[PDB]
Amino acid sequence: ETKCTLKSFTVEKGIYQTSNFRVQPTESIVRFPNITNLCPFDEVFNAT
Amino acid sequence: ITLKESGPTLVKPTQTLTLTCAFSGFSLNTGGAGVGWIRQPPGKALEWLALIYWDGDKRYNPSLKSRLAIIMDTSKNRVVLTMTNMDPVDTATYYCAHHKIEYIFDYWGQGTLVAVSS
Ligand SMILES: *[C@@H]1O[C@H](CO)[C@@H](O)[C@H](O)[C@H]1NC(C)=O
């Protein structure tokens, strides 16, 4: 990387710079609110 | 589930049969279900008698409309089956049962037998 960032086959002494140190996540967490006020489709299909 | 049947053991030919059956525990939030009555004498097979639904419909076998009456308590306690002007071949036993349309008779009662005193 310190060769490919200068387009040269030889690099001199000293401190250089490269790409950043990236930490990636693993999984996804989705917590929307608890179900409530269920719609009354249960009573209309089970209606007498 | 308990369905108990009550009635006389011996009756007069000029009397009236007053059978009762009491049911304990059902899902009343339904449609097409009800209470059915069926008759059985020894020496020949079963003969269906009557049906009631929860809405108060009142049905029997055909050509027996005049001599069959039902009393509903409208309190989910008991169903009363009343007959007048009997036939002495009908000395028989009675089963009161739950009556669905897919389940032809859902739960079988114990039933009660009666014979004429003549
Ligand atoms: C009716 O109620 C029952 C529970 O008694 C439920 O399982 C069913 O999903 C409801 N819907 C129908 C079949 O109408």
PDB file of C-alpha atoms and ligand atoms in Angstrom:
ATOM      1  CA  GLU A   1       0.000   0.000   0.000  1.00  0.00           C
ATOM      2  CA  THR A   2       2.785   2.489   0.633  1.00  0.00           C
ATOM      3  CA  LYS A   3       4.106   1.589  -2.840  1.00  0.00           C
ATOM      4  CA  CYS A   4       0.726   1.699  -4.612  1.00  0.00           C
ATOM      5  CA  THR A   5      -0.237   5.085  -3.127  1.00  0.00           C
ATOM      6  CA  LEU A   6       2.809   6.830  -4.641  1.00  0.00           C
ATOM      7  CA  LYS A   7       2.837   5.064  -8.075  1.00  0.00           C
ATOM      8  CA  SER A   8       6.484   4.121  -7.497  1.00  0.00           C
ATOM      9  CA  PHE A   9       8.438   0.907  -7.001  1.00  0.00           C
ATOM     10  CA  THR A  10      10.747   2.473  -4.387  1.00  0.00           C
ATOM     11  CA  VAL A  11       9.671   4.422  -1.302  1.00  0.00           C
ATOM     12  CA  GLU A  12      11.887   6.561   0.908  1.00  0.00           C
ATOM     13  CA  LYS A  13      12.074   6.552   4.697  1.00  0.00           C
ATOM     14  CA  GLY A  14       9.511   8.348   6.835  1.00  0.00           C
ATOM     15  CA  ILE A  15       5.934   8.024   8.028  1.00  0.00           C
ATOM     16  CA  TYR A  16       3.283   7.695   5.314  1.00  0.00           C
ATOM     17  CA  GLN A  17      -0.518   7.569   5.186  1.00  0.00           C
ATOM     18  CA  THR A  18      -2.854   4.815   3.985  1.00  0.00           C
ATOM     19  CA  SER A  19      -6.544   3.934   4.248  1.00  0.00           C
ATOM     20  CA  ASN A  20      -8.426   4.144   7.533  1.00  0.00           C
ATOM     21  CA  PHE A  21      -8.999   1.397  10.114  1.00  0.00           C
ATOM     22  CA  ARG A  22     -12.649   0.415   9.665  1.00  0.00           C
ATOM     23  CA  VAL A  23     -14.551  -1.880  12.047  1.00  0.00           C
ATOM     24  CA  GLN A  24     -17.625  -3.526  10.511  1.00  0.00           C
ATOM     25  CA  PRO A  25     -20.808  -4.646  12.321  1.00  0.00           C
ATOM     26  CA  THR A  26     -22.199  -8.181  12.382  1.00  0.00           C
ATOM     27  CA  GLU A  27     -26.007  -8.360  12.657  1.00  0.00           C
ATOM     28  CA  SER A  28     -29.150  -6.213  12.668  1.00  0.00           C
ATOM     29  CA  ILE A  29     -31.477  -5.454  15.591  1.00  0.00           C
ATOM     30  CA  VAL A  30     -35.058  -4.190  15.004  1.00  0.00           C
ATOM     31  CA  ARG A  31     -37.278  -3.509  18.039  1.00  0.00           C
ATOM     32  CA  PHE A  32     -40.527  -1.690  17.064  1.00  0.00           C
ATOM     33  CA  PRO A  33     -43.221  -1.466  19.856  1.00  0.00           C
ATOM     34  CA  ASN A  34     -45.272  -4.407  21.318  1.00  0.00           C
ATOM     35  CA  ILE A  35     -48.366  -5.282  19.272  1.00  0.00           C
ATOM     36  CA  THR A  36     -51.537  -3.699  20.726  1.00  0.00           C
ATOM     37  CA  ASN A  37     -55.120  -2.761  19.707  1.00  0.00           C
ATOM     38  CA  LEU A  38     -55.284  -5.752  17.433  1.00  0.00           C
ATOM     39  CA  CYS A  39     -57.870  -5.050  14.740  1.00  0.00           C
ATOM     40  CA  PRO A  40     -61.104  -7.060  15.211  1.00  0.00           C
ATOM     41  CA  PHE A  41     -60.746  -9.387  12.243  1.00  0.00           C
ATOM     42  CA  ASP A  42     -60.999 -12.303  14.689  1.00  0.00           C
ATOM     43  CA  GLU A  43     -64.600 -11.515  15.665  1.00  0.00           C
ATOM     44  CA  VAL A  44     -65.833 -10.982  12.097  1.00  0.00           C
ATOM     45  CA  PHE A  45     -64.524 -14.307  10.753  1.00  0.00           C
ATOM     46  CA  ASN A  46     -65.798 -16.107  13.872  1.00  0.00           C
ATOM     47  CA  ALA A  47     -69.144 -14.275  13.800  1.00  0.00           C
ATOM     48  CA  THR A  48     -72.282 -16.335  14.390  1.00  0.00           C
TER      49      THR A  48
ATOM     50  CA  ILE B   1     -69.673 -32.432  29.722  1.00  0.00           C
ATOM     51  CA  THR B   2     -72.881 -33.764  31.309  1.00  0.00           C
ATOM     52  CA  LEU B   3     -76.267 -34.178  29.617  1.00  0.00           C
ATOM     53  CA  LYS B   4     -78.808 -35.874  31.878  1.00  0.00           C
ATOM     54  CA  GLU B   5     -82.215 -37.085  30.696  1.00  0.00           C
ATOM     55  CA  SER B   6     -85.304 -37.207  32.918  1.00  0.00           C
ATOM     56  CA  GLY B   7     -88.755 -38.631  32.296  1.00  0.00           C
ATOM     57  CA  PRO B   8     -91.381 -41.125  33.445  1.00  0.00           C
ATOM     58  CA  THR B   9     -90.877 -44.880  33.299  1.00  0.00           C
ATOM     59  CA  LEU B  10     -94.530 -45.842  32.731  1.00  0.00           C
ATOM     60  CA  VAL B  11     -97.124 -43.603  31.069  1.00  0.00           C
ATOM     61  CA  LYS B  12    -100.815 -43.770  30.212  1.00  0.00           C
ATOM     62  CA  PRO B  13    -101.943 -43.939  26.554  1.00  0.00           C
ATOM     63  CA  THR B  14    -104.073 -40.806  27.143  1.00  0.00           C
ATOM     64  CA  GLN B  15    -101.352 -38.896  29.036  1.00  0.00           C
ATOM     65  CA  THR B  16     -98.621 -36.582  27.648  1.00  0.00           C
ATOM     66  CA  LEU B  17     -94.934 -37.486  27.534  1.00  0.00           C
ATOM     67  CA  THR B  18     -92.820 -34.721  29.114  1.00  0.00           C
ATOM     68  CA  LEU B  19     -89.135 -35.585  28.689  1.00  0.00           C
ATOM     69  CA  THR B  20     -86.366 -33.215  29.752  1.00  0.00           C
ATOM     70  CA  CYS B  21     -82.672 -33.101  28.983  1.00  0.00           C
ATOM     71  CA  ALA B  22     -80.210 -30.795  30.733  1.00  0.00           C
ATOM     72  CA  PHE B  23     -76.793 -29.871  29.323  1.00  0.00           C
ATOM     73  CA  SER B  24     -73.861 -28.434  31.287  1.00  0.00           C
ATOM     74  CA  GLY B  25     -71.132 -26.589  29.399  1.00  0.00           C
ATOM     75  CA  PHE B  26     -71.102 -25.537  25.747  1.00  0.00           C
ATOM     76  CA  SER B  27     -69.634 -22.860  23.489  1.00  0.00           C
ATOM     77  CA  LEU B  28     -72.765 -20.801  22.854  1.00  0.00           C
ATOM     78  CA  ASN B  29     -70.948 -18.407  20.472  1.00  0.00           C
ATOM     79  CA  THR B  30     -71.552 -20.594  17.427  1.00  0.00           C
ATOM     80  CA  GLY B  31     -74.001 -21.202  14.607  1.00  0.00           C
ATOM     81  CA  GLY B  32     -75.661 -24.323  13.222  1.00  0.00           C
ATOM     82  CA  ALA B  33     -75.403 -26.211  16.525  1.00  0.00           C
ATOM     83  CA  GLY B  34     -78.206 -27.194  18.854  1.00  0.00           C
ATOM     84  CA  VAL B  35     -80.055 -29.897  20.755  1.00  0.00           C
ATOM     85  CA  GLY B  36     -81.349 -33.065  19.106  1.00  0.00           C
ATOM     86  CA  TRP B  37     -83.649 -35.890  20.196  1.00  0.00           C
ATOM     87  CA  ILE B  38     -83.524 -39.460  18.851  1.00  0.00           C
ATOM     88  CA  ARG B  39     -85.681 -42.533  19.592  1.00  0.00           C
ATOM     89  CA  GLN B  40     -84.835 -46.237  19.776  1.00  0.00           C
ATOM     90  CA  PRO B  41     -87.151 -49.222  20.372  1.00  0.00           C
ATOM     91  CA  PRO B  42     -85.897 -52.815  20.595  1.00  0.00           C
ATOM     92  CA  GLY B  43     -86.469 -54.966  17.524  1.00  0.00           C
ATOM     93  CA  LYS B  44     -85.826 -52.264  14.900  1.00  0.00           C
ATOM     94  CA  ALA B  45     -83.158 -49.652  14.233  1.00  0.00           C
ATOM     95  CA  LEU B  46     -82.821 -45.986  15.228  1.00  0.00           C
ATOM     96  CA  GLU B  47     -85.371 -43.331  14.287  1.00  0.00           C
ATOM     97  CA  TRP B  48     -84.528 -39.631  14.469  1.00  0.00           C
ATOM     98  CA  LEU B  49     -87.044 -37.405  16.263  1.00  0.00           C
ATOM     99  CA  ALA B  50     -86.266 -33.697  16.479  1.00  0.00           C
ATOM    100  CA  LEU B  51     -83.877 -30.742  16.291  1.00  0.00           C
ATOM    101  CA  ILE B  52     -83.681 -27.289  17.907  1.00  0.00           C
ATOM    102  CA  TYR B  53     -81.028 -24.653  17.193  1.00  0.00           C
ATOM    103  CA  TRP B  54     -79.980 -21.745  19.407  1.00  0.00           C
ATOM    104  CA  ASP B  55     -82.257 -19.345  17.477  1.00  0.00           C
ATOM    105  CA  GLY B  56     -85.405 -21.275  18.392  1.00  0.00           C
ATOM    106  CA  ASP B  57     -86.134 -23.256  15.226  1.00  0.00           C
ATOM    107  CA  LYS B  58     -88.406 -26.223  15.862  1.00  0.00           C
ATOM    108  CA  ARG B  59     -88.145 -29.221  13.536  1.00  0.00           C
ATOM    109  CA  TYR B  60     -89.194 -32.874  13.521  1.00  0.00           C
ATOM    110  CA  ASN B  61     -89.569 -35.721  11.080  1.00  0.00           C
ATOM    111  CA  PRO B  62     -92.203 -35.001   8.390  1.00  0.00           C
ATOM    112  CA  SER B  63     -95.909 -35.841   8.835  1.00  0.00           C
ATOM    113  CA  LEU B  64     -95.515 -35.728  12.647  1.00  0.00           C
ATOM    114  CA  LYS B  65     -96.055 -31.984  13.082  1.00  0.00           C
ATOM    115  CA  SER B  66     -99.242 -32.007  15.180  1.00  0.00           C
ATOM    116  CA  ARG B  67     -98.174 -34.368  17.993  1.00  0.00           C
ATOM    117  CA  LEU B  68     -94.740 -32.897  18.840  1.00  0.00           C
ATOM    118  CA  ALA B  69     -93.982 -29.789  20.904  1.00  0.00           C
ATOM    119  CA  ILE B  70     -90.812 -28.312  22.433  1.00  0.00           C
ATOM    120  CA  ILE B  71     -90.311 -25.950  25.378  1.00  0.00           C
ATOM    121  CA  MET B  72     -87.073 -23.960  25.592  1.00  0.00           C
ATOM    122  CA  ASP B  73     -86.208 -22.419  28.955  1.00  0.00           C
ATOM    123  CA  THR B  74     -84.167 -19.582  27.327  1.00  0.00           C
ATOM    124  CA  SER B  75     -81.809 -19.813  30.312  1.00  0.00           C
ATOM    125  CA  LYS B  76     -79.378 -22.586  29.151  1.00  0.00           C
ATOM    126  CA  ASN B  77     -80.670 -25.126  31.689  1.00  0.00           C
ATOM    127  CA  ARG B  78     -82.932 -27.744  30.074  1.00  0.00           C
ATOM    128  CA  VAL B  79     -84.941 -28.600  26.957  1.00  0.00           C
ATOM    129  CA  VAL B  80     -88.462 -30.059  27.263  1.00  0.00           C
ATOM    130  CA  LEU B  81     -89.873 -32.533  24.714  1.00  0.00           C
ATOM    131  CA  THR B  82     -93.648 -33.076  24.878  1.00  0.00           C
ATOM    132  CA  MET B  83     -95.790 -35.630  23.021  1.00  0.00           C
ATOM    133  CA  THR B  84     -99.557 -36.123  22.874  1.00  0.00           C
ATOM    134  CA  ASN B  85    -101.670 -38.965  21.402  1.00  0.00           C
ATOM    135  CA  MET B  86     -99.114 -41.762  21.456  1.00  0.00           C
ATOM    136  CA  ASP B  87     -98.791 -45.030  19.451  1.00  0.00           C
ATOM    137  CA  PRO B  88     -98.092 -48.186  21.533  1.00  0.00           C
ATOM    138  CA  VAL B  89     -95.240 -49.306  19.224  1.00  0.00           C
ATOM    139  CA  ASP B  90     -93.265 -46.259  20.440  1.00  0.00           C
ATOM    140  CA  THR B  91     -92.431 -47.815  23.835  1.00  0.00           C
ATOM    141  CA  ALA B  92     -88.767 -46.986  23.549  1.00  0.00           C
ATOM    142  CA  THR B  93     -85.702 -45.197  24.889  1.00  0.00           C
ATOM    143  CA  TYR B  94     -84.677 -41.584  24.305  1.00  0.00           C
ATOM    144  CA  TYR B  95     -81.283 -40.002  23.660  1.00  0.00           C
ATOM    145  CA  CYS B  96     -80.792 -36.236  23.909  1.00  0.00           C
ATOM    146  CA  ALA B  97     -77.586 -35.111  22.230  1.00  0.00           C
ATOM    147  CA  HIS B  98     -75.642 -32.178  20.865  1.00  0.00           C
ATOM    148  CA  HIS B  99     -76.518 -31.638  17.207  1.00  0.00           C
ATOM    149  CA  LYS B 100     -74.037 -30.215  14.694  1.00  0.00           C
ATOM    150  CA  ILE B 101     -74.153 -30.552  10.896  1.00  0.00           C
ATOM    151  CA  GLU B 102     -70.786 -32.272  10.337  1.00  0.00           C
ATOM    152  CA  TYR B 103     -70.947 -34.047  13.690  1.00  0.00           C
ATOM    153  CA  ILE B 104     -74.294 -35.808  13.205  1.00  0.00           C
ATOM    154  CA  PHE B 105     -74.587 -36.153  16.981  1.00  0.00           C
ATOM    155  CA  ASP B 106     -71.622 -34.743  18.890  1.00  0.00           C
ATOM    156  CA  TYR B 107     -71.983 -35.953  22.492  1.00  0.00           C
ATOM    157  CA  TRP B 108     -74.293 -38.835  23.389  1.00  0.00           C
ATOM    158  CA  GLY B 109     -76.580 -38.585  26.400  1.00  0.00           C
ATOM    159  CA  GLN B 110     -77.502 -41.430  28.721  1.00  0.00           C
ATOM    160  CA  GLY B 111     -81.169 -41.405  27.712  1.00  0.00           C
ATOM    161  CA  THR B 112     -84.299 -42.754  29.381  1.00  0.00           C
ATOM    162  CA  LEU B 113     -86.683 -45.581  28.504  1.00  0.00           C
ATOM    163  CA  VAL B 114     -90.478 -45.526  28.788  1.00  0.00           C
ATOM    164  CA  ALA B 115     -93.277 -48.008  28.080  1.00  0.00           C
ATOM    165  CA  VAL B 116     -97.061 -47.732  27.975  1.00  0.00           C
ATOM    166  CA  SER B 117     -99.059 -48.842  31.022  1.00  0.00           C
ATOM    167  CA  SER B 118    -101.895 -50.355  28.956  1.00  0.00           C
TER     168      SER B 118
HETATM  169  C1  LIG C   1     -61.690 -18.252  15.618  1.00  0.00           C
HETATM  170  O1  LIG C   1     -61.259 -18.423  16.965  1.00  0.00           O
HETATM  171  C2  LIG C   1     -60.326 -19.488  17.101  1.00  0.00           C
HETATM  172  C3  LIG C   1     -60.072 -19.735  18.580  1.00  0.00           C
HETATM  173  O2  LIG C   1     -61.303 -20.128  19.194  1.00  0.00           O
HETATM  174  C4  LIG C   1     -59.048 -19.109  16.376  1.00  0.00           C
HETATM  175  O3  LIG C   1     -58.083 -20.157  16.501  1.00  0.00           O
HETATM  176  C5  LIG C   1     -59.360 -18.888  14.909  1.00  0.00           C
HETATM  177  O4  LIG C   1     -58.185 -18.418  14.245  1.00  0.00           O
HETATM  178  C6  LIG C   1     -60.486 -17.870  14.752  1.00  0.00           C
HETATM  179  N1  LIG C   1     -60.812 -17.683  13.340  1.00  0.00           N
HETATM  180  C7  LIG C   1     -61.698 -18.358  12.600  1.00  0.00           C
HETATM  181  C8  LIG C   1     -61.347 -19.756  12.176  1.00  0.00           C
HETATM  182  O5  LIG C   1     -62.746 -17.849  12.245  1.00  0.00           O
END
